[PDB]
Structures are given as C-alpha cells and as structure tokens.
C-alpha cells in the first residue's frame, strides 16, 4: 500500500521518464523468446530438408540444388533478425540503466539536502530523538538503497515478467497440450522448495542452542580468567567446554546430511521435468504435425522464465529494504516537530537593553531521571545589572539558559524579554541579541579568521584583528604560522582548552549582543588563565545586561546581584552584602569551600596447509565432483540426440529411439547425480565438522595456556572472542565446500567441453573460442568496473558526511543560527560533486551492460552464420548447434561461482589469520619447573627488590615506583595506604600474572617467573573483591580437583564449616548438591566472599591473599568473615590489602605504601604511637 506511494516524489521529467523506463523494459524482455523463435525456425527447415533426404534416397544432386536454395533464402531473412533485435536490445539496455543513476541521483540529492536543512530548522528535536551521529550513519546507508529502489532492479523485475507470461503466449499458440504440462510442474517445484525452507528453519535453531553452551562456558571462564588459573581448575573448564563441542558436531553433520538430500532431490525433479517435457513433446511429433520443434524450444525458454521469477525476488527485497529504510527517516525529514523551535518567520520587536524577567517557571527535562530541576521562579533583573547564579547541581542553571533561547517553551509561566513575550517572536532575531559563551568551547576545525566569522556574516578582518586583541587571544595566532589563516589542525591539538575559550569570548564580543549569557566562562581554567579571561570578560561587560554563572565565588563577589538556589526555588536575592549578612545559600557555599582484528601479513594458502595437517582421508569427494561435473554434458548431448532423431532420419523407429533415450536419461542422470553429489556432500561435510571441533578445541585450550596483554589487558572484549570462534569455524566449514565447488565447475565447462570440441569441424573450435573466453572476461571486467566506481563514491560521501556529523554532534551549532545556513551552502557545494559523478557513471554502467547484451545476440549470430554456408554445403549434422548454447551457459555457471568464492576465500583467509596468531603464542604459563614439588620450600622469605610496574596501557601513572619489600614466614603482612599505590599489583606479581617491567621477585632465590606452576596453585589462598560462581553446582564451585588436586566429601565439609558458609548450605534441600543457577549471581555478597574463602583453604596453602573483602561487605557479614579468616591462619603468611584500617591492628607488620614507596613501616602499636602518616590514616578512616 502506502510504502511505495510516498517513495515516489518524482520531479517534472522523472514522472514521465518512469514510464519510458517501464516502456523499454517490456520490449527488452519480450525480445529474448522472439529471438529464440528464430532458433526454432532454423530447426524447422533443417527437419523439412532432412526427413525427405533420408526417406527418398533416390537423388543426392537434386538435394544439393533446391534444398540449399530454400536454406539460402531463409538465411537472408536470418541476417536481418539477429542484427535488428540486437540493435533494439542495445538501446533499451542503456535506457534502463539510465533509470539507475539519473532518476536516483536527483532523489538522493533532494533527500540529503532536505535532511541537512530540516535538521538545522527544527533545533531541539533532532537531539531529542535518538542519539547524535548515529543519524548520519543510518542516513548515508539509506541513500545507497535509493540507488536500488529507483534502480534498474525494478526494470529487471518487469523484464522478468515479460520473459515469463509473454513466454507462455507464444507457447500456448504453437501448442496448448505442452502448456498444461509446464503449468503443472510449477506447483511441484514450489512444494519442494517449501520443504527446503522447513529444514533450514529447524536445523538453524538447533546449531544455535548447541553453540549456546559453548559460548556461555567460554564467556564466563575467560572473564574469570585470573581466578581459574589461580585454583588450577583449567582442565575441567576445558573438558566441560569439550562436552558442548561433542554435541554441536552431531547436529552440524545432520544439517549437512539433510542439506545434501533436500538439494539433491531438488535437482532431480528439475531433471525429471526436463525429460518429461521431451517425452510428451514427442507424442506431438510422431502422431501429429502439432509440434515441428517450435514448442520444444519455446518451452525451454518458459523454464528460463520460471527461474526469472527467482531473480525477481531479490529485486523486490531491495525495494522493500529501500522503502522501509526511507519511510522511517521521511518522518524526521518531512514534519519538523515545531511550535517551540522552528527557525524562520515571526515578528521582530526592538531590543535595546532587554530585561530578563522570569515569571513563575517550573520545568522538567524529557528523561525522567531529573524531573522539575526548576520549580517556581520569580526573578526580575533591571537593565545594566549583572546577575549571579550560585546553587547546587540539580538547580537547573543550564535549564534557564535554554528557556531564554526558546529552545523549549516552559511548562509553567513564561519568560518575558524586554517585558515582552518570547514565544511570539522570531527565534533567529532573538538568538542574535543573546550571546552565549558555552561550557564546552568546541568549534569547527577551520581558520582563526573563519571562527570569528561564524559569529556574524559581515565581520571584516579588522574586526577579527580588534577581537583577538581585546580577547587576549592575540598571542597564539602569532606563535602559529600564518596568523589568521592558520587552520585549526587535527581534532583540536593546535589549541589548549584555554585557548578555545578565548576564541569563544572573542566571538561573543564580535556578535555585539544586549544579553550575554556566560556559562563556565571563568570556571574549568587554571589559576593563571583565570585572571586573563576575567579581565577580558570585565571589558566585555558593563555595556550590556549579563548573567554570569560561576562556581568560583571570588568572581561572584563583585557581581551586582546574587540569587540563591537550593533546588530550583529562588531562595536568596540581594547583592554580596545582603546575602552574607543574612547567612543564605551563598554564605553556606563560602563556608564549604573555605584493529586487533586486522592482522597485517596476508596468508599464502596457509588455509589448505593447516587443513591438510588435520586431514585424515577423502579423495572420493573431489573425484566424485569431477565425474558429477562431466555428468552435466550427458544431458545436453542426449537432448541433441532427441531433436536428432526428429531432424534427420525417416519416420520408421523415430519413436523407438526416443523411448529408449527417455529411460536412459533417467538412469544416467537422476540416480547417479544424487549419489555422486551426496558423496561430495559427505566429504566437505565431514571436513567442516572435524574443523569445527578441532579449531575451537585448538584455540580454547591454547587460551587457558595464555595470559598477559590479553587476559592481563584484553584489547578485544570476551564476547568478541567467542564471536571469533563462532564465525571462524563456520567460515572454514563453507571454505572446504568451495574447494570441491571450483573442481566441479572446472571439469564441467573447460574439461568436458574440450572432448566435445574434438568431434567439431575444427573450424568451429576456432570460431567458438573467439566467443566463449571473451564473454567470460567481459563479465568479470564488469565486476571490476562496478567496484571501481563504488570505491571512489564511498570516499566522496564520507567527506560530505564528516562535515555534517561534526555539526550535529556539536550541540553549540544549535546555539548559533548565523553559521547554520552558511553551513548549508557548503553542503550543497560538496553534494554537487557526487551529482556530477552520478552523471558520468550513468554512461559507464550504461555502456557495460549494453555491451553484455550485445554479446548474447552476437553469439547466436556467429552460430547461425557459420552454421550455414561452408557447413550447410557439405558436412551438415544435427548436433553441435545445441552444444554451442550449452557452452554459453557453462561459462555462466563458471564466472558466477568464481565470483562467489572470491568473498569466501577472503573471509577464509581472515579466519586463518586468527588461527595462526593464536598458534604464534605468547608463552607465558605454558609450564615450567625449578623444583619437583619439594615440601621443604614451604613459605620462605619472599623478596621484592627494586620493582617498578606500570600496566600495558602506559598512561595510567606507574603505580610501583622504587618498591622493595620483605615478608617473613608465619606473619601477616598488611598493606595499607590509598588507591593507585600498587596494593593489588603486589598480589598480582606474587601470583604470576604480568611480572614487572623492572626489578625481580624471588621465592628463596628462584624467581616467580621460573616457579613450578602446579605447586604454586597449591600455595595460594586467593580471595577476590568480586567472587564469582561457575555454572557448576556449589559443591563443584567450592572444590575443584585436577592432577594437582584431589577432592572428597570430608574435604568440602571442612571447607564449608571453616568458611562459615555452612549456614547457607543447611538451608535449601539436597544440601551441597543444591544448584542455585543463573551463574550464581543470585547470591548475596556475604555468601560470595565466604565461598571464595572455602576455595582458599581447600588448596591447603600457607599463603593467604585477601582482596578487599571488608570494603565489599558491611556489618555482621564483615565480622563473620574475619572469624573464618582468624581460624584459618594457624601461624602462616597472609596479605590483607583491605582499606579498613579498623580491622587491621592484628597485622604484625603494617606497611604504609605511597606510590611504590614505603613511607612508614612497622607493627601497629609503634605506628599508632607516631603522629605521622599511619595514625592520620586510622583517624581519617573513622
Ligand atoms: N541538559 C541536560 N540534561 C541532563 N543533565 C544535564 C544537562 N546539562 C547538564 N547536565 C548534567 O546534570 C547535572 C545537574 O543537572 P542541572 O539541572 O544542569 O543542574 P546545575 O545546572 O544547577 O548544575 C549537571 O551538573 C550535568 O553534569
Ligand atoms: N589489567 C589491567 N589493565 C588496565 N588497568 C588496570 C588493570 N587492572 C587494574 N587496572 C586499573 O588500575 C587501577 C589501579 O591499580 P592498583 O594500584 O593495583 O589499585 P588499588 O591499589 O586501589 O587496589 C585499578 O583500580 C584499575 O582502575
């Protein structure tokens, strides 16, 4: 209905031209079966000659005279047919592609310009609706679909219907029996495709549920990565992950099995129809003059028409996607929300020293996060006053500044400019009397001259000069090469934040306004710049009424009037003295303040290198593809033999040969093709299956064996890694299938065709290869030309979009209106360049396609041309005329598949790059020894000497600078201080995750780096500051066995008892075997921390590590957990990094750490007796 009605918006010539396009489209479509009627005619005469030459056999010289004269006469008319249709189909070709560019061009240009223009004219609304910059993304995709909707695709659709319905017209008239037979296979072929779609829908959801587990198991483990290494539960998360893989491979293969059978059987019913047509076609020969070979050909083209319906379907999908995308932005495009925004027309008053008078204003933001920021306002400011706003954040100081522009229309009351209504008058004019100095001084990246020039479209370079000088912006322009003509470089790097603000002050001075609205125009600057901007602001004031917003109370001292706010309600009014004397809000504030996915080196067939390593057998698939490839010509030769025994040979046994060939056609084709196709299907099926396992196996097991700048700093999120495993293993699954797919078409065209060529006339071979290789290259060279024009188009539109997106993302473009239409001039000038490229590529796209359809007729041309003459005179044969047409169609399926597997190989290579860099390794925690798991190395005195550290992201302050520590056995090492002191970092280096940039840490003398990995996970008592459960039952969470670990009933009991989680274990029936579910994210914190403790003491370490388990908990929970801790330590090292210094007083050695530097160190009572750092930390904690 409505979807395409809006879509048209077709110009004066366009609406006419839509009809010219339709009009060429029919007659383009029609010409192909008419062209094939001539092919039937050439058959008809050859038969009228052959049946009497063979059935008389009483002359051979009469036949050489009279029979060849009719053939000669017929050939004179043939010459004027193929040339005529060719000359039509050439022109109409160019016309339908001109539809593609020229009509679309003018639509896109209209859309783009309306879009950019409607946006600047609706102000607020664009910002209200969705998020800025996502709009120019979606818009630039939309205008691409426009090319497709006003595209030649529509023309192709009409053309398709003409070959179809129009095919049946000629069919019906030359014989109506066979019409009914073709009309019946259409519902059969449609039923079969219907089972296909069913199989697809069922098997997809199945692969998805299966892979779902493999993604959930892989997701949680790789985020919990530091914890799982540390308890040594790797081999179990590996096995569980392997478990999901065994089930996923069996649904993957059944899918492949079903796909081949559905697809095999599909081709079967096509082959049956192809035979069936002949069999019922023959019945019209032997006993009737009803078919003379006309309908036999004409009905083959009706099948090509039925496939033309299949080509329609994409055309339609392009059109739907084009309308749907369009009508949704049409909504913002056409229809501004308006009547509180606009930008154009209305009355203009005269403002000389406007007042600000606020009358009973309450307002709320759209988001219902902050509702009524403003509520009840009476403020009356006389001209030549300076009003100060002090408050709290939520007073909506920003809100009053928006209402003043008339961006919103206030909920209650009105704000009256010069005591006159602000909702009656033109916005534009209103904007010009009101200067605004922004809280973000972001500007365009254009010349210093252009930035002053945005303030009024009349500033001469003198005034620019005058501007920078009073605005004390006159410094940086001189340092900068080229004075004013210095373009603001990069993304803003030629200017400080301070310098930007200075350009904005200079600009608001150039505008000469009577209201000056200063929003953090003295706040967010350094102590030096502050004075500089203040003096400039002073010089800009005292000739105008102004409102200054500042958080700096030193500048609000000297304001004429201060007005207090505590939430939106105007509380104080008076000047400095009046406020301070009463002790208002103001007096209150005085007192408070006093990619990684683009791998660079490209593969060189590393695909098949790695495939071939994990390859075990299957030489039969490719061999089966070769025979299935030569199997295709057996039909075409058989069809020659059909029409063969009908053209030449008398009436006796014509029928018999056809009956025999019918049966032969069945057994040779339908039956063997299914078998041999399923054999190839079993081969690439199992190939992708075992790749699907082994790859995901070989990545994920290698992942648990890596750490460090991808698990000690991920540069691709967990979900993106899981995505990579998905996509990759699926992609190779299709890749193996593409190998055999190329071999299939290769023997199918080139190979078997050669055999066929040897039985040609030796001239035909020569003539033929002057077509077939040429038309192949010619479609490829079209693809090349297609992408070449596309690539250059994307660059041009990128620049017009870049300058658009920069304006819309800046909310300060809406503040101005003066540079809006200036901006819309530039957008116009930029959009003219694609207009010209659209006209240039109209002839380019136009001439390529015309030349492709010119080679179709030229084939048929050389075919019938040469087929007569020297060949008709002597050595006339029924066959090799139909094989030429097959050869044309063999190049079609070769070029088509070759182009198809171009993106297949691309994505296959990319998948390979990933699998190679995983195989490339980072060889940290691969497994090492320096002991035999000796039990006389237990604890030690662990040394840290001269250790510096800074994260793999370098800008984040180096947290360890000059750190050296010591820890003696049997003693709790507290570590206290404050954040960013490398508290946590110390625990990380003792666990062996990302060891320090410089310096070293030793056990007894052997580095952590060379420490025995296995024994290290039976030497840790780690506790997270976020403990997280696994999908495993609580019993299995609590304890995890391995070949480094044991588990037992008695163990989990003692762990739960000691950890005090046993309270919670009691509740819930099945006790320990009770599963919570939902990744056990349903537990309360107290429960969680205990669960981490129970894990800790299972490992039987002599080192406990505690990560903020009293700053992630509160109350009785902290205490109970400290009790679990107290009974665990029976005289062993513990690390408490916790920031509650009130529960640290038991620690034997407290280290006060500043930025890697031990400041004070010692036992509690010493440090506490000091009035130094430590005591100050305990004082301030409480
Ligand atoms: N237009 C806005 N809508 C929503 N939040 C805003 C907006 N502008 C600023 N903010 C943020 O919300 C905070 C408080 O809201 P606001 O009503 O602007 O209080 P105030 O202007 O008095 O500081 C600001 O400090 C800022 O971080
Ligand atoms: N793997 C990491 N990569 C990047 N930054 C990290 C990583 N780990 C932690 N950080 C960040 O570095 C901060 C400071 O580190 P650290 O001094 O160890 O913290 P704290 O002393 O408060 O426990 C962390 O609080 C966090 O914001």
Residue numbers in the entry: 33 to 626, 684 to 1271
The article reads:
In the post-hydrolytic state the structure of the wild-type protein has been resolved at about 8 Å resolution. The current structural data implies that the ADP/vanadate state (post-hydrolytic state) can be predominantly inward-facing with the NBDs separated. The cytosolic nucleotide-binding domains (NBDs) are separated but ADP remains bound, especially at the first NBD. Two additional regions of density lie outside the NBDs in the expected positions for nucleotides. The density close to NBD1 displays higher density than that at NBD2. Densities corresponding to ADP molecules were displayed in the map. The density found close to NBD1 was significantly higher than the one at NBD2 implying that the NBD1 site may have a higher occupancy. Several reports suggest that NBD1 has a higher affinity for ATP and ADP/vanadate than its C-terminal counterpart.
